[PDB]
Amino acid sequence: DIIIATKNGKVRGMQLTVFGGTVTAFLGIPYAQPPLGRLRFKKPQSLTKWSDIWNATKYANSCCQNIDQSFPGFHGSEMWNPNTDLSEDCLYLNVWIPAPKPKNATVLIWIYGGGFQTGTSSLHVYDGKFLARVERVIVVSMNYRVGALGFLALPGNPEAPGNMGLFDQQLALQWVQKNIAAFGGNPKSVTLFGESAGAASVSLHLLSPGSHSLFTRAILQSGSFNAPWAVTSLYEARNRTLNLAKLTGCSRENETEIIKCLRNKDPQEILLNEAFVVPYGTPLSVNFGPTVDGDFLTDMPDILLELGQFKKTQILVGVNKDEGTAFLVYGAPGFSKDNNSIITRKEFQEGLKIFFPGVSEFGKESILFHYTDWVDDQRPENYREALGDVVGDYNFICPALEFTKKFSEWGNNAFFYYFEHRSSKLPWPEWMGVMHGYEIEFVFGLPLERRDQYTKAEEILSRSIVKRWANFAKYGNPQETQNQSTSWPVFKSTEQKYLTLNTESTRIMTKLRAQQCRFWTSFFPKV
Amino acid sequence: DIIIATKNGKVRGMQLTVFGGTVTAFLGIPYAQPPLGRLRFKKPQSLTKWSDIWNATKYANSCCQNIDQSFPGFHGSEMWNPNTDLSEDCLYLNVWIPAPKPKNATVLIWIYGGGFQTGTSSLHVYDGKFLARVERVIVVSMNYRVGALGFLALPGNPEAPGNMGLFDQQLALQWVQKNIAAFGGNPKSVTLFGESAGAASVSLHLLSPGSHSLFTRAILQSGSFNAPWAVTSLYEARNRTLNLAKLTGCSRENETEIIKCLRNKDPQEILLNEAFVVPYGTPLSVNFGPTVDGDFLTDMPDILLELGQFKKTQILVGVNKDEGTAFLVYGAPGFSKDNNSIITRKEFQEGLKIFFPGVSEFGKESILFHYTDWVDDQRPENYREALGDVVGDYNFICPALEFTKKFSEWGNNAFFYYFEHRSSKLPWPEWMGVMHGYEIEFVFGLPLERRDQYTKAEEILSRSIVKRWANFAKYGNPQETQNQSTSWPVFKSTEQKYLTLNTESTRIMTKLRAQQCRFWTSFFPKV
Amino acid sequence: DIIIATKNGKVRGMQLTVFGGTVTAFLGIPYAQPPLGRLRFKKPQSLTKWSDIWNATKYANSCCQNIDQSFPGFHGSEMWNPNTDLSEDCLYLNVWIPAPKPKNATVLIWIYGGGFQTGTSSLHVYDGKFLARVERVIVVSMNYRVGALGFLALPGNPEAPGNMGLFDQQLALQWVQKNIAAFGGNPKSVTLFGESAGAASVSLHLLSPGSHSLFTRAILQSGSFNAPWAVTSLYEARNRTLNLAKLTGCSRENETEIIKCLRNKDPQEILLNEAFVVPYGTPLSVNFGPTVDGDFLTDMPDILLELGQFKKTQILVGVNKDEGTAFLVYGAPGFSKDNNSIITRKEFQEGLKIFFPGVSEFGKESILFHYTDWVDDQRPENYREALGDVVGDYNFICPALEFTKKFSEWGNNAFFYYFEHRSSKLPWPEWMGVMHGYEIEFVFGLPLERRDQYTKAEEILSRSIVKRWANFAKYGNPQETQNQSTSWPVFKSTEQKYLTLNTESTRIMTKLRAQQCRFWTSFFPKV
Numbered sequence A, B, C: 001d002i003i004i005a006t007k008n009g010k011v012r013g014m015q016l017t018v019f020g021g022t023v024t025a026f027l028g029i030p031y032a033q034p035p036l037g038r039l040r041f042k043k044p045q046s047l048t049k050w051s052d053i054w055n056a057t058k059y060a061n062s063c064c065q066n067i068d069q070s071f072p073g074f075h076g077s078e079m080w081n082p083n084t085d086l087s088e089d090c091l092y093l094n095v096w097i098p099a100p101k102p103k104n105a106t107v108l109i110w111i112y113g114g115g116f117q118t119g120t121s122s123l124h125v126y127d128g129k130f131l132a133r134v135e136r137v138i139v140v141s142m143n144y145r146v147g148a149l150g151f152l153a154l155p156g157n158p159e160a161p162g163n164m165g166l167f168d169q170q171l172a173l174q175w176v177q178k179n180i181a182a183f184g185g186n187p188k189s190v191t192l193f194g195e196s197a198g199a200a201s202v203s204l205h206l207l208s209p210g211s212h213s214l215f216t217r218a219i220l221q222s223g224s225f226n227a228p229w230a231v232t233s234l235y236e237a238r239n240r241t242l243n244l245a246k247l248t249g250c251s252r253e254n255e256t257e258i259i260k261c262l263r264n265k266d267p268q269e270i271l272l273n274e275a276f277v278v279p280y281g282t283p284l285s286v287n288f289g290p291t292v293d294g295d296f297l298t299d300m301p302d303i304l305l306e307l308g309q310f311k312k313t314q315i316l317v318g319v320n321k322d323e324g325t326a327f328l329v330y331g332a333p334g335f336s337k338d339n340n341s342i343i344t345r346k347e348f349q350e351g352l353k354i355f356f357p358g359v360s361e362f363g364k365e366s367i368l369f370h371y372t373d374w375v376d377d378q379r380p381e382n383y384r385e386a387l388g389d390v391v392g393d394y395n396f397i398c399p400a401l402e403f404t405k406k407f408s409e410w411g412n413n414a415f416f417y418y419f420e421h422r423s424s425k426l427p428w429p430e431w432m433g434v435m436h437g438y439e440i441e442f443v444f445g446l447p448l449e450r451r452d453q454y455t456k457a458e459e460i461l462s463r464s465i466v467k468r469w470a471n472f473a474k475y476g477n478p479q480e481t482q483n484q485s486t487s488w489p490v491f492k493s494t495e496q497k498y499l500t501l502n503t504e505s506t507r508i509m510t511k512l513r514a515q516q517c518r519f520w521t522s523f524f525p526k527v
């Protein structure tokens, strides 16, 4: 039996057996008042106080959200679907601690991805018990609101001010500040890490003044706020919010009245409409996301980044070799997971049309031009590979690299990785390569689990990443010092060294996707 | 309805419609006891406290001051004349805030020019509502005492200690420190900006110990305290103060008695005499200005500048291409606004006599020599252009450049601009070029106003300056980051880069008026 | 009438007319309990408190001390003799302030010389009223105990712990910290300056932990603690203290008993014996001076200097062209002030014998060797000039230069001057040149006094030093910025630039007395 007195009252956890030892898990600790009825669309408000012992012994409700139904029954997609009841009552967090209770452990806070429209901390691939067992770090994760219910904005007006999901996150980070020492945590040693939209969230916490003092350092996997799907403009945010009212027969006059009306709709009606607040989406649509609200975000992030207004600290940033592929089977013509997807020039052009709907003909010709001077053999897989690279480079790799350049020019240490190992257990087909999302299991140390059959090499690779992440968190420096590993150099502008993470040959390389990033970064934004 | 509780009690403002949105204006908030009767010539004293709601809904009294009557009915001069009642009761300030109320906005404090003899915050070209609407900054301006009533000095003696107008300013800056957060302001992010005498005031706040902690950074348009009209010596201050007594039949024995006597004169009698406390003025006379009082100013400013005694922070400094011209029609022979003013050598010499009255024959020959080796064609406009340059270089550009050299040698970032756009709406004739004072409307964003017919190019130029000023204020760096603009480099000694602001071609240049500034700066002061 | 409430109670000063204006002088303010009876030889103790108004309107008792009787009636010597009653009751200080009272003036604290055996703040050449009038600085000076009564040491034992005179000084510096703001002073801007033993005192305050926070910066004229007369060893201090007891029939058993006995002797008996506690003195004997007591001084000063244990701040250090001469007429054979003192080789050798009594024959041959390879003409004044240089170099110039090297190697700004003007009013004969002590009148601004007939050039030189000293005090940098003067560069090791102060040609020079200082500094200490 294990009970911890927090600032809001007692909580009980369970004992887990991990890897020959023990871990104490507190699942589903509330961190805010349930945001229901009159609190829907409003910033999270703080917890009442409680008599009795709270039983944090099972995962809590995931937040309301649409589910991916493109591959029903397929483990590749379904592993990302929520594994607990959906409810509006979803502001809870989990804590995993070493046994015996440590004395001043470094704290890792995970923020999940899902396009700001989906995700949940209770997923199998986010289970923190392994990191706690092996590295003696404490691992925290929280649920935050997604979709309209999390990011509906009607500018300035506090009935729906914008960024509610980011504030749920910020309020959980605070809960860590006030309570984590009771669990044996060191509030002065907190690293945020997250992937995709979770990684862009982490990048925004770096920019947010209310976040400055709620963490020490940061890890960004395949995401940053300068990615093109990450921040909704005020223009498009209003168009969307009013388009939603129209669809739910909530078009009114007085703005507060539109919110009051939307607060009377049932969650399902709002979920059902979210998809259509846009004339045409892509498989990369973020219908409701971060906006510049003058509160969490005080100006457009490009400006803040460029002029150096953000927390000075170390960052670890990285991406996967085939980020783009996973998106092509959600709309691109002649793509399937159940065949090799050898496509034609004509399919590719149509492809660009799906991914770049509001872009001029010339703009599209310009991508075709940059990505189809091969180099050279009349390889059939030419066009399929180029469409993956197009989507990866524009959406993930290039924005990640630029964020890293920009951040390090203000003087701080940064480390960049390029993950190129395809999991032996990957259920998607071989042509999709080293996919978006599939370094996570390596970071949480799933292949360490003996009775799960990853390879021996995967076990060793995982053991080595877990160590680098943990060393990063505790000491600002992601080295594996014992087993005579390849030293990971800092990323500077000019040299721009990165580290390759693979199962065979770990290498130091320079200037990842140089030619491609000149295209996305200097030419394409003018278009 | 909008009411803010301040430290002195409540105030009500009005709602303005600007550019499709709203701005809240509080006009005429008092910031000091009215300096009347026994408080005339004394440092401002602090506000009593008040029950009821103060109605800050119209501009307040401008301070007592003579008016320019050289061009009655001419919009070019009259636009600078005071647009509210003159009264001794004039220590008030205005606040403009974004709607919805922001959370921690950067604050811009404007200090007007007028030779320390004239000016008022209520002028059309100082209306802060545009900056507030477009940049979401808060804009403050205040009225401070000018002429004898603001700068009469009888050394050490506190009945008339000197610098009262500078202390009115300092006391308004304080009012910002104590109250601005109630308006949504961030007291820790205050930029002072001002033009001409207003710009020299800003430079003196940098030197004043009582000001150090009342602002963050500073913007100086066409003015600095090392300009030759900016600081009155103790010698000339006494001669003047006693000359005024003599003229008003206030010559006494006991010094306090002379003040007591002057405090019995009516404002108009003092105004009427101010002009003659000098044997001969120029169109650049500052009969009553800043002095070294051992209080606001603790030593002569040249020494403080040279030896590095001032606030360490970023500055933005600049000047206009034809600063000198506006002064030539206020006394220089054969100059008129109603004709081209082609003058002769003989007129030019007489001209120097008007502008450099107490200077030796040789001194005057030396200006003629430096400014009349052309380069070369027998152009008729030769002499007219040289007299403008003489007055500009000596009075504005050269002192501004030297102040910037001197300030940056102590390690801080500085930015220098050279404004060379002549407003399409300028009522003065073409030969007067890019005049003193006419970048102000661009900085306050008047050409942004659609229904006012500035050009489209002027709109775009203004939009770009407003952004650079605002970025400067918020982040210390005056870049326009979005529209791929010319980056503005820091001004260092040795390289001395500056930025040109025009409607066509924005450029990086080096060593503005190199030859001319060697003349004014190294040779002329010996004379 | 002018009354200031201090922490010990009220004081009244007088009004002085200086140079067309006014200065307020408080003469003889007590700063410690009178150190009489049972307090003789003990550290100074703090002031009781007082009702009534203290009348600080005349100079106070100078401390007990022997007088120079070598030239009775001669203004050259007698100007250094005490000009008030000698008494044991002598711990008082003077304050001079600008009129009108300033607001936050920089403070100059003067510490007089006199070999630690003589001196007094009430001397004519230490009158602070001129500095106060002209520079608007506040000037403080204090009386501190000298000779046995100030520096008697019987190690560790607190009845006579050592350094009492240094602690009198330290306690006056404290009095400045607690009280000077009431006079208009800024306690955070205090420069210590002093000459000879006063200059060595200043150098020891830099080393003393109890002094660290009682001043900002320091000026050393012809003195430093590494000079060879400056610090008595523990060995020689005991030998002396016991030799004094023996002479006064106070030889006892219990050490406290010897003090108790000496506290019963009358001041005159102690004064009369001080001279003989040494088998043989020189005209540079310091029979009772600073010692390493483990309290004011925590280790030998050479070590502290060399290893960088002292206050980090700016210093101004300098010396006079003929420091040595004044000492030759107090014992050196064939020297007189009443003739040219052309001496022989044989006289010179005897001379070395007077000045280096306990030094080996070889040691003496070594000085002769270094100082008598001329360069070359058979000039009669050869030997007379060399004996002056010998005494100057060893006692003043060389130790001053070494102190400056050593101090600047730890990173702080230092300025070095070489004063080479012989006063037109000097009563000593021409051959004695630019003597020890005769830059003081220039620093206090005596030649500024119109009705005193120094030359016009001397007036201008003085005006310029007063300004450099004052700029040093206020701003850390001794420049004269207005009258286009020679800029004074910092003294670094390697380059070692110094400034020459003379009436004609002010110059930047390098490596003063290079050859000579290698001799005194590297070879002579081994001997």
Ligand SMILES: *[C@@H]1O[C@H](CO[C@H]2O[C@@H](C)[C@@H](O)[C@@H](O)[C@@H]2O)[C@@H](O[C@@H]2O[C@H](CO)[C@@H](O)[C@H](O)[C@H]2NC(C)=O)[C@H](O)[C@H]1NC(C)=O
Pocket: A332, A333, A334, A335, A336, A338, A339, A340, A341, A342
């Ligand atoms: C790979 O599959 C795609 C995708 O669509 C198909 O899925 C397959 C697994 C198959 O079972 C089939 O029934 C299904 O249509 C193929 O593209 C399609 O080609 C078909 C038939 O010619 C067209 O009707 C469609 O327009 C197009 N479908 C879509 C959804 O775009 C593709 O040809 C196939 N590629 C191969 C074998 O290389």
Ligand SMILES: *[C@@H]1O[C@H](CO[C@H]2O[C@@H](C)[C@@H](O)[C@@H](O)[C@@H]2O)[C@@H](O[C@@H]2O[C@H](CO)[C@@H](O)[C@H](O)[C@H]2NC(C)=O)[C@H](O)[C@H]1NC(C)=O
Pocket: B332, B333, B334, B335, B336, B338, B339, B340, B341, B342
């Ligand atoms: C430009 O005008 C000046 C200024 O004075 C004149 O203003 C004009 C607009 C005109 O209407 C006229 O009545 C008025 O005098 C001229 O200089 C003047 O020249 C006049 C006539 O010869 C002399 O009497 C004056 O001394 C002198 N006036 C002043 C006030 O200095 C100037 O000649 C004219 N320049 C041109 C046409 O190039």
Ligand SMILES: *[C@@H]1O[C@H](CO[C@H]2O[C@@H](C)[C@@H](O)[C@@H](O)[C@@H]2O)[C@@H](O[C@@H]2O[C@H](CO)[C@@H](O)[C@H](O)[C@H]2NC(C)=O)[C@H](O)[C@H]1NC(C)=O
Pocket: C332, C333, C334, C335, C336, C338, C339, C340, C341, C342
């Ligand atoms: C300069 O004077 C010295 C010092 O002593 C003398 O002082 C003089 C002013 C003079 O009035 C005289 O009476 C007095 O003795 C002279 O050295 C002295 O030489 C004398 C006479 O030969 C010797 O008896 C002494 O040993 C020696 N005196 C001392 C005190 O050392 C010196 O010769 C003279 N120098 C000249 C004229 O160049």
Ligand SMILES: *[C@H]1O[C@H](CO[C@H]2O[C@@H](C)[C@@H](O)[C@@H](O)[C@@H]2O)[C@@H](O[C@@H]2O[C@H](CO)[C@@H](O)[C@H](O)[C@H]2NC(C)=O)[C@H](O)[C@H]1NC(C)=O
Pocket: A239, A240, A243, A244, A246, A247, A276, A277, A278, A279
């Ligand atoms: C945002 O504003 C309008 C809103 O019109 C939308 O109504 C919503 C409730 C939703 O159902 C959505 O499908 C619909 O788009 C957008 O107008 C669209 O633009 C086209 C012209 O290209 C017109 O045909 C329609 O008005 C509408 N589209 C359709 C398919 O009916 C508008 O484009 C959008 N603004 C943007 C994206 O900047």
Ligand SMILES: *[C@H]1O[C@H](CO[C@H]2O[C@@H](C)[C@@H](O)[C@@H](O)[C@@H]2O)[C@@H](O[C@@H]2O[C@H](CO)[C@@H](O)[C@H](O)[C@H]2NC(C)=O)[C@H](O)[C@H]1NC(C)=O
Pocket: B239, B240, B243, B244, B246, B247, B276, B277, B278, B279
């Ligand atoms: C400051 O002191 C005197 C004051 O004389 C002045 O009296 C004033 C009240 C006012 O009316 C003003 O016009 C007048 O100047 C100055 O004396 C002037 O100097 C000239 C000699 O060049 C004499 O003729 C007069 O005393 C007087 N001028 C006139 C036109 O009558 C004095 O010059 C001034 N000091 C300065 C500027 O340094």
Ligand SMILES: *[C@H]1O[C@H](CO[C@H]2O[C@@H](C)[C@@H](O)[C@@H](O)[C@@H]2O)[C@@H](O[C@@H]2O[C@H](CO)[C@@H](O)[C@H](O)[C@H]2NC(C)=O)[C@H](O)[C@H]1NC(C)=O
Pocket: C239, C240, C243, C244, C246, C247, C276, C277, C278, C279
């Ligand atoms: C310190 O200790 C002795 C003390 O002897 C001294 O007695 C004093 C009271 C005083 O009168 C003083 O004149 C006398 O010196 C010193 O002894 C001296 O050394 C010489 C030998 O060179 C002997 O002749 C005497 O004992 C004495 N001198 C005289 C002239 O009588 C001792 O030298 C000294 N220690 C040092 C300087 O290190």
Ligand SMILES: *[C@@H]1O[C@H](CO)[C@@H](O)[C@H](O)[C@H]1NC(C)=O
Pocket: A012, A055
């Ligand atoms: C928490 O679980 C334990 C099981 O041992 C139980 O005793 C306790 O009542 C639980 N809390 C509840 C049911 O609210």
Ligand SMILES: *[C@@H]1O[C@H](CO)[C@@H](O)[C@H](O)[C@H]1NC(C)=O
Pocket: A103, A104, A186, A188, A189
């Ligand atoms: C934990 O470590 C921090 C420094 O990182 C320290 O200041 C804090 O007091 C420690 N708390 C403990 C040991 O409980």
Ligand SMILES: *[C@@H]1O[C@H](CO)[C@@H](O)[C@H](O)[C@H]1NC(C)=O
Pocket: A254, A255, A256, A257
């Ligand atoms: C609209 O209604 C809201 C909510 O009831 C009210 O408080 C507000 O003042 C109204 N605003 C306008 C602009 O009519």
Ligand SMILES: *[C@@H]1O[C@H](CO)[C@@H](O)[C@H](O)[C@H]1NC(C)=O
Pocket: A463, A464, A467, A480, A482, A483
């Ligand atoms: C280091 O070495 C051993 C094998 O020699 C391995 O089992 C262990 O996992 C390694 N530790 C890390 C942190 O990689």
Ligand SMILES: *[C@@H]1O[C@H](CO)[C@@H](O)[C@H](O)[C@H]1NC(C)=O
Pocket: B012, B055
């Ligand atoms: C301020 O103006 C309002 C107008 O609505 C008024 O009600 C109030 O009395 C005013 N204050 C005055 C007149 O002092």
Ligand SMILES: *[C@@H]1O[C@H](CO)[C@@H](O)[C@H](O)[C@H]1NC(C)=O
Pocket: A209, B103, B104, B186, B188, B189
């Ligand atoms: C505003 O920002 C400053 C830092 O510039 C911060 O210290 C202050 O507390 C903030 N106040 C708010 C958010 O109200």
Ligand SMILES: *[C@@H]1O[C@H](CO)[C@@H](O)[C@H](O)[C@H]1NC(C)=O
Pocket: B254, B255, B256, B257
């Ligand atoms: C002159 O009168 C003033 C004001 O009444 C008085 O307080 C002051 O002491 C007097 N000064 C002189 C120098 O006569």
Ligand SMILES: *[C@@H]1O[C@H](CO)[C@@H](O)[C@H](O)[C@H]1NC(C)=O
Pocket: B463, B464, B467, B480, B482, B483
């Ligand atoms: C940037 O670009 C657009 C036009 O593409 C323009 O309307 C807007 O005013 C510009 N913003 C700034 C700050 O200049």
Ligand SMILES: *[C@@H]1O[C@H](CO)[C@@H](O)[C@H](O)[C@H]1NC(C)=O
Pocket: C012, C055
């Ligand atoms: C100080 O001097 C004044 C002279 O005006 C006198 O009134 C006062 O009594 C003096 N203090 C004394 C004598 O103790």
Ligand SMILES: *[C@@H]1O[C@H](CO)[C@@H](O)[C@H](O)[C@H]1NC(C)=O
Pocket: B209, C103, C104, C186, C188, C189
């Ligand atoms: C005097 O100046 C210091 C800084 O050198 C400042 O901290 C202090 O408060 C000032 N005191 C005054 C103006 O009374």
